[PDB]
Write a protein that binds this ligand. Structure first.
Ligand SMILES: Nc1ncnc2c1ncn2[C@@H]1O[C@H](COP(=O)(O)OP(=O)(O)OP(=O)(O)O)[C@@H](O)[C@H]1O
Ligand SMILES: Nc1ncnc2c1ncn2[C@@H]1O[C@H](COP(=O)(O)OP(=O)(O)OP(=O)(O)O)[C@@H](O)[C@H]1O
Ligand SMILES: Nc1ncnc2c1ncn2[C@@H]1O[C@H](COP(=O)(O)OP(=O)(O)OP(=O)(O)O)[C@@H](O)[C@H]1O
Ligand SMILES: [K+]
Ligand SMILES: [K+]
Ligand SMILES: [K+]
Ligand SMILES: [Mg+2]
Ligand SMILES: [Mg+2]
Ligand SMILES: [Mg+2]
Lengths: 523, 523, 523
């Protein structure tokens, strides 16, 4: 359609206004004194959330240029959520700070591409300094504290995550789901988890989580690829009067002969899903055999000759819950048979004792780790649904932060790590003066998380930023108690991955946006 | 419908206003100090782009006559992008300059057709002078510099293109695709590339690139043309539950019995495509055999008697990525078997040693060059999707510019080549005075790229244009450093094809538009 | 009333938009290639004028903040017109340039008060350098050239002013008035001129010149101050049926018993005016006696005892034209008696021969200079009234410029003097960096007159500014012939007072306006 085309300062101030609307809505949530945001839903009751990416996602502005700025910055929170599952508000605050100071530099006549290059150089150096400053999770041993900080100082949530990682291992799979009582429960049940996703984007359920849950599902397993429709239409009908939702695990799944016909079939009462299987050839066969033994099901094959038309519903596997996500699909509780599960575990232990090839040994030890660790499940306890969603979001943040902590390490929380790396980057210089100003813009913007935290405390951000900068090491500002101390000692720990990801995604988007001279949108 | 009809100066100033809106939006992006343009998308987040043709494509105006002018000039950027893949902003700047000065001449009462003839004569002479001024890429040997200049002074991108051309040859196929890390990666993998396009315009995917990508596709090969639908409906169903997207390579593909039925089948989850095969008869058979051996597939034939109904999914070829474009379709990574690939390479080397016919020898050496060079793939590394699109556009510009440089040569960058050829054309005369004024309009307009570059530097375009004109040879103005020097020495190189194409397409459209006395549009 | 209150950038861009509207309307008139502006009048036919202050005065904008900016800049042209009578367009161009560059510096975050201080320091230094660069009019001897340049290269006007100054002296009084023929006539007639103004602001005639003209007036002279109304009401009635307009010359004139009653008397057919007399005591008596002898009138006094009630209309003085202005009031042609005038001249020559006191000698020699020089009158010849107003404005500009040239000297025209003094001020520094930037803003803005002249020539301002800067001395750019040369040799001379006044008034207003953070206006 016809386009509104804005240039220079007018376009930049409109885009910055959109950035500011999104970032203010997100930044009210930052820190232990951060507040909640109510997002209206046409689907049902409004959602009360502290999660920054949720607020960012809901933001859309009437002014098209302001909306453009808001959408580009919303990408920061989305990328931070996708990569680390936490720090989306920190990422938004950093992005807004970089954009604000970089646009001020642009208004000062400095070359915006050189400002972006300086920002990028400063952020690369700051990521290196964050890696250097990071303390490995083995050394720190504060999973409870990391989860507590990520759960908005909910010590119960952090303790639950710590117990789950003590039971299923620091690499074991933990899944958050809605409970029934008022208290958060933890249960380690036998389940499975593989790094695959759904093959159809229309499988999304009513909740907007992007991960689809099925209660008491039926499991179908196949390694050979079926061709004709009429040889599993009876099997499809059998599962279509079994009563339990169908989850198929295969090598790969198409949509033009399976997904389209079935979506033309139902209207959305009960869901049927199909996903890939990890590995290929013998590894995929072993994976499907393990899943079938876990769920009590069977795997069809060409060599066996066991056809689908002879399969019954008792032959197929049965589970209690499955959560399918693009990144990773988990089967929460497959009943099967406990004796059969133990026998398979013993058989694969004999496989440990027999195998000698390095790749075979490592994949088989991955199999035994997945079997022995099991699946930890956290039942979120809340009196109401709005409290359920808020608490589940906080527990999911805690899980993501603890995973990031065991993956990449921890740094001082409360924006202190960014302050320290900014102080360590004070001598960083670019190729010209505009690159130096971009570096300074990035360094000042890495003070923004701490300053926003202090603002959310009702305190003076410049005084606290000055006091933290004047300190050294993990000295920082407890925002829960409004006093200074060693951030590690008071347990205010951030995952290094979370801080680094927030900085990187904020920098990429914000450095791109400060380089914009014209914006084109609809009238 | 009813038509608004405008004449003479009113029509011309409206059309020029539309030209100016489009050209200003595009020209803010010109040069190393050029800035980015944010294009709003209804599909998702706005795209930040320096690419001039992207900005030009997004431009559409409310005023119908201004929109008419904008659309005709948008044709300049589109043609420059189609022909050279670079210089679209230079082409737009040249077109706007020719239009502005030619409309000034028209207002001076000079015959617009004679002005157009003078512009055309000057541009033909300037293309000849650009060919004379061009330095062959073998002599210059600055592929890294050409790619760096085209990538907006991104030395990493230019070095990556230079390494890719050092690995797969200056004629080898290089494909840009989205990476996963933050860094640009280069990998030379075994693949295929042929000069064919899709037979259906509705195969366009969600991205507006015009080239469609498929991840881990299945490969179907056929030289004989099948007739009845029921003899590959089972095979179609097999691929429709194989899980991988289908890509058919045949002699030629229709749409009234294949495309319409399948588009009535799916709603757009997984795509199935079919394309032509290069050559005919024995050459097409050799091409399909080579592709099948690369992907591990098989080729059906009448002499063999191997029917499609007996084909299995293991018999069909499997790849990792394919990119289908109207100009050229590439298979990025076909796994097949490495030993089989090497054996086929040895067999075709024996074919080199055996064949003696000149056409057969040259086509067989083309086959061995395509097999030995392989496919270079550049993984664009970016933290975010908007940065991914911007960086991928810059790398695609660099690839197009390096291809144009090895095809047609290089000239001094920064608009210097056009300045030099304009100086060499100072004595060019037409058949009358209006043709001479058209020649002068073209010659002055070829200063416009340098002048716009200087304007984007915040500097004085007339002073720098005067200084560059007063110099000789590759003397010009480094806009990155705002100082004069030998453009070849500082590595500011433009592909001669890019400069020539920009000038020619700008001239054709602009010379046509300055001849317009009436415009007819909707009310 | 309720106030719209704007802050920061919004207020500044609105004010700059108003500045730009006024300055563009004025600047189209600058230089020999400058064009005319038509100002609509509700009174009658529109006025075509090249005069910059006329255009500036007519400018008023709908947007209140833009109007505010326009009004403050209009003060520049008004002050330049009041002080020098020329250079109002140069003053406006300088003011717009200072405002534009200073607002750019303000947007760059620099302290606007320090920018204003730097501008003021640069302008003080530039005024000193203009005084140093100035060539006295005695040395240059180019009154014809100064008048020609001020009359928009009208050599006839400059020659007329040169002849008038050759006849009545370089200090003699010259008055421009409408002629009757098509040619500009010059006549030196016996008249008087004193530095006084009207005592009532409601005496303004229908033309908006601010100086009121009376044709064939009657002259009344008085040194003693009358008290009762009834003792000159008969005399007032006598002049009220004499037929000629009344002009009273007294010590001082009130309004509450003279002006209010008479303005309640007439409706505006024939005007009666009263003005002060120069000097005091004996000097005022000598002045009134000289004026009475020039006009054939008589002066009342207490010592003489000659009362007003006995005065007749033949006793009162009679003239042909008088022009009354606040700065200076002139009697153009008082008939009186030529023999009486010569006898009075001889008597005052005897007074020269008799007087010895220095103050008495100098005032008496001022008297004899005023009597001997007489009054030069330039009859503007034009076919039409619009041409009459345009030509009269140009001749008035020429008169003001020649007066300024004989007062303060001449410098190279065409903005060259400002370029030279800016070059001589390249090492000027302030107390801080913002003051240095203000100095640079002023120095760059003194290039603006030449650059605007070049723009009005259709040429490239940066190239010509560079060429003029690269020269030295009076080297500059003839804009009439579009070529370089010695500005003094080609007769392009500006009065030093005009250039200095333009710079000073532009600097004062513009430096004040760049310091503005908030604007308050009506809604
Ligand atoms: N008691 C505390 N004192 C100081 N800083 C704290 C404290 N508790 C948390 N923080 C800091 O608050 C930040 C995390 O805040 P929050 O979890 O509200 O937002 P986020 O992680 O940026 O984003 P989101 O959770 O929405 O993805 C971290 O920098 C953390 O160190
Ligand atoms: N450092 C530099 N100094 C001078 N000129 C430069 C420099 N870097 C690039 N240029 C010039 O800028 C022009 C290319 O600019 P840019 O890539 O932004 O636009 P384009 O090639 O016209 O169009 P597009 O890339 O949008 O298709 C060329 O003329 C090139 O020589
Ligand atoms: N032939 C010429 N070549 C170069 N400069 C010239 C020439 N004639 C006049 N100028 C310059 O033009 C300027 C005067 O222009 P103009 O009289 O139109 O405007 P102004 O004096 O600024 O204002 P205004 O007359 O409206 O009060 C001076 O700087 C003068 O030197
Ligand atoms: K939060
Ligand atoms: K560009
Ligand atoms: K003027
Ligand atoms: Mg958090
Ligand atoms: Mg380019
Ligand atoms: Mg003048």
């Amino acid at each position: 359609a016809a386009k509104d085309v804005k240039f220079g300062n007018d376009a930049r101030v409109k885009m910055l206004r959109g950035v500011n609307v999104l970032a203010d809505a997100v930044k009210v949530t930052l820190g232990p004194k951060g507040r909640n945001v109510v997002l209206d839903k046409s689907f049902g009751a409004p959602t009360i959330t502290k999660d920054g990416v949720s607020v960012a996602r809901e933001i859309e502005l009437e002014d098209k240029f302001e909306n453009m700025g808001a959408q580009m910055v919303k990408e920061v929170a989305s990328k931070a959520n996708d990569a680390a599952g936490d720090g989306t508000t920190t990422a938004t605050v950093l992005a807004q700070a970089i954009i604000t100071e970089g646009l001020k530099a642009v208004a000062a006549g400095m070359n915006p591409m050189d400002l972006k290059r300086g920002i990028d150089k400063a952020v690369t150096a700051a990521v290196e300094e964050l890696k250097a400053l990071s303390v490995p999770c083995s050394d720190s041993k504060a999973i409870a504290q990391v989860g507590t900080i990520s759960a908005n100082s909910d010590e119960t949530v952090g303790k639950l995550i710590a117990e789950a990682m003590d039971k299923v291992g620091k690499e074991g799979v933990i899944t958050v789901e809605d409970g029934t009582g008022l208290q958060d429960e933890l249960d380690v049940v036998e389940g499975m988890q593989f790094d695959r996703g759904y093959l159809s984007p229309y499988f999304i359920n009513k909740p907007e989580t992007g991960a689809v849950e099925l209660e008491s599902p039926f499991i179908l397993l196949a390694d050979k690829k079926i061709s004709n429709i009429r040889e599993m239409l009876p099997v499809l009908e059998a599962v279509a009067k079994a009563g339990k939702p169908l989850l198929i695990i295969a090598e790969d799944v198409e949509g033009e002969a399976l997904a389209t016909l079935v979506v033309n079939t139902m209207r959305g009462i009960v869901k049927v899903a199909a996903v890939k299987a990890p590995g290929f050839g013998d590894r995929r066969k072993a994976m499907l055999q393990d899943i079938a033994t876990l769920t009590g099901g069977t795997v069809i094959s060409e060599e066996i000759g066991m056809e689908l038309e002879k399969a019954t519903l008792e032959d197929l596997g049965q589970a209690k819950r499955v959560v399918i996500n693009k990144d990773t699909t988990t089967i929460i509780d497959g009943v099967g048979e406990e004796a059969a599960i133990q026998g398979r575990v013993a058989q694969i232990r004999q496989q440990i004792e027999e195998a000698t090839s390095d790749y075979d040994r490592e994949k088989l030890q991955e199999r035994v780790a997945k079997l022995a660790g099991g699946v930890a499940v956290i039942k979120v306890g809340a009196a109401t649904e709005v409290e359920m969603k808020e608490k589940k979001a906080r527990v999911e943040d805690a899980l993501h932060a603890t995973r990031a902590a065991v993956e990449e390490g921890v740094v001082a929380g409360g924006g202190v790590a960014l302050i320290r790396v900014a102080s360590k980057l004070a001598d960083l210089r670019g190729q010209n003066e505009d690159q130096n100003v971009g570096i300074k813009v990035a360094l000042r913007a890495m003070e923004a998380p701490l300053r926003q935290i202090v603002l959310n405390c009702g305190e003076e951000p410049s005084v606290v930023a000055n006091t933290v900068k004047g300190g050294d090491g993990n000295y920082g500002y407890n925002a829960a108690t409004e006093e200074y101390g060693n951030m590690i000692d008071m347990g205010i720990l951030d995952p290094t991955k979370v801080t680094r990801s927030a900085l990187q995604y904020a920098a990429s988007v914000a450095g791109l946006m400060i380089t914009t001279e014209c914006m084109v949108t609809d009238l």
